[PDB]
Structure formats: structure tokens, C-alpha cells
Paper text:
We obtained two crystal structures of recombinantly expressed R. appendiculatus Japanin: (i) a tetragonal form with one copy per asymmetric unit (data to 2.2 Å) and (ii) an orthorhombic one with two molecules per asymmetric unit (data to 2.4 Å), both in complex with cholesterol. In the orthorhombic form, the two molecules in the asymmetric unit form the dimer. The dimer interface involves the 67–75 and 105–112 loops, the 93–99 strand and the 129–141 helix. Figure 2b shows details of the dimer interface between molecules A and B in the lattice, centred around the Phe93A:Phe93B side chain stacking contact, with two additional pairs of hydrophobic residues forming contacts across the interface: Pro139A:Tyr70B and Tyr97A:Ile137B (and equivalent ones due to the twofold symmetry of the dimer, Pro139B:Tyr70A and Tyr97B:Ile137A). Buried in the middle of this hydrophobic patch are the 2.0 Å hydrogen bonds between the side chain of Arg95 on one molecule and the main chain oxygen atom of Ile 94 on the neighbouring molecule. At the surface rim of the interface the Asp98A:Arg132B (and Arg132A:Asp98B) salt bridges are found. In the tetragonal crystals, the same dimer is formed by the asymmetric unit and a symmetry-related molecule across a twofold axis. The tetragonal crystal-form dimer and the orthorhombic crystal-form dimer superpose with an rmsd of 1.5 Å over 297 Cαs. The dimer is likely to represent the solution species, as indicated by Multi-Angle Laser Light Scattering (MALLS) in solution. All three crystallographically-independent molecules show the same overall structure, and each molecule in the crystals binds one molecule of cholesterol.
Numbering used by the authors: 2 to 153
Write the structure that this text describes.
Amino acid sequence: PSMPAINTQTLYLAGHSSKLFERNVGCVKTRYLNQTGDWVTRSLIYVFTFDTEPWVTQAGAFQVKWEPYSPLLRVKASDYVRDNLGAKPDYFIRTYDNDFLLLSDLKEVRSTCSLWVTLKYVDRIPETINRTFYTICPDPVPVPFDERCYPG
Ligand SMILES: *[C@@H]1O[C@H](CO[C@@H]2O[C@@H](C)[C@@H](O)[C@@H](O)[C@@H]2O)[C@@H](O[C@@H]2O[C@H](CO)[C@@H](O[C@H]3O[C@H](CO)[C@@H](O)[C@H](O)[C@@H]3O)[C@H](O)[C@H]2NC(C)=O)[C@H](O)[C@H]1NC(C)=O
Ligand SMILES: CC(C)CCC[C@@H](C)[C@H]1CC[C@H]2[C@@H]3CC=C4C[C@@H](O)CC[C@]4(C)[C@H]3CC[C@]12C
Ligand SMILES: *[C@@H]1O[C@H](CO)[C@@H](O)[C@H](O)[C@H]1NC(C)=O
Ligand SMILES: [Cl-]
Ligand SMILES: [Cl-]
């Protein structure tokens, strides 16, 4: 079935547990690139937010595997994405719909969250999604809305 990590729509980071924070790493999103067998190749696009010099758009690739109805998302990250952004080889899928995905850290006990949404919800997340995020995630920090990340 359809789950956002293996679908073609772009996902934008809407929130995360505070412990995950990386200074000057903004406008985080992942685009769908292609698929080979059960592995979907996505890009991780981010902007190096200096104040100043001018902002630097960066892109690294990674692959994901999802067995149908599995609670786990397999992630095969590149060395750059892995070492620089801390991408883990597995994430726990808490819940999702076509327009959102809530992932947790599998190995950590105080399991860090990352909340992802499709373009319609960057300015405002639905009360239901927001309530789930704030209930089950430790130190929930929303990503603030910034028109420079998606001029439109
Ligand atoms: C996303 O959810 C945030 C968390 O909501 C809280 O936790 C949920 C699990 C649920 O229990 C819900 O009922 C809780 O409110 C939202 O943050 C909360 O927003 C409140 C805004 O009214 C805030 O309060 C403020 O306002 C009162 C006046 O009515 C003041 O007296 C008070 O000092 C506050 O300023 C509340 O404290 C806050 N809670 C937390 C834990 O941060 C958030 O708004 C929501 N966002 C969206 C996009 O819906
Ligand atoms: C979205 C799906 C398909 C999988 C994404 C997997 C990887 C690439 C994701 C999962 C959790 C993500 C991290 C979550 C939180 C933060 C803190 C923020 O301040 C900078 C980005 C950063 C560091 C993210 C980088 C990318 C990340 C490691
Ligand atoms: C597409 O897949 C190829 C190999 O299958 C890979 O090199 C590339 O990163 C993917 N993305 C695009 C858009 O080329
Ligand atoms: Cl600024
Ligand atoms: Cl709503």
C-alpha cells in the first residue's frame, strides 16, 4: 500500500525532538528520485543557513525499503548523509497518512522523533497530527515557517 516514504510526493521536516537539532541546517526536505526493486531512492535536500554569507543548497541521496504494514523503515544512507546528518539504518514508523509521516529512533530508549509533511501542511499542521506529535515525542520542537524555504 501507499505510505509517504515510498510515495512520489516531496516531504518537508515539520518537527523534531530537540536533541536532534543541527545548527544552520534548514529547509529540510526529501524528494522522490526513483525505484529499483523494493528500494526507493530519495534525495535529502537542505540549506546551509548562514547569516551571512549567502545560503548554500545541498543535496545527498539515500534509499528506503518498506515491507508492507511493517513497523520499520529501512534506510540505506550515503556516507555524507550518515556522518553529517546522523541518518540511522532503521526508523520506527509511529503513524502516517498520505500527507504526513511520524518516525522515531528505534534503538534509543528516550526515542527521538522527526515529523514530515507534504507541501499543503508547512504553514500549519492539522490538530490531530500536532496532538500525536506533542503526546508521544520527547522535547517536541516544531520547525518554524520560513518563506525563504519554499517561495510560494
Ligand atoms: C500543537 O500542540 C501544542 C501542544 O498542545 C498541548 O499538548 C497536547 C498534547 C494537548 O494536551 C493540548 O491540549 C495542549 O495544549 C500546542 O501548544 C499549546 O498551545 C496553547 C495555546 O493556547 C498553550 O497555552 C498558551 O495559552 C494560554 C492561554 O489560553 C496561556 O495561559 C499559556 O501560558 C500559553 O501561552 C499551551 O501551553 C501549549 N502547550 C505546550 C505543551 O506547548 C500548539 O499550539 C499546537 N500547534 C498547532 C499548530 O496546533
Ligand atoms: C523522510 C524519510 C523518507 C527518511 C529520512 C531519513 C533521514 C535522512 C532523516 C530522518 C531524521 C532526520 C533528521 C531529523 C532532525 C534534524 C534536526 C534539524 O535541525 C536538522 C536536520 C535533521 C538532522 C534531520 C536530517 C535528516 C534525517 C536524519
Ligand atoms: C536514479 O537511480 C539511479 C540508479 O538507479 C541513481 O544513480 C540516481 O541517484 C537516481 N536518481 C536520479 C534522478 O538519477
Ligand atoms: Cl534571519
Ligand atoms: Cl485540521
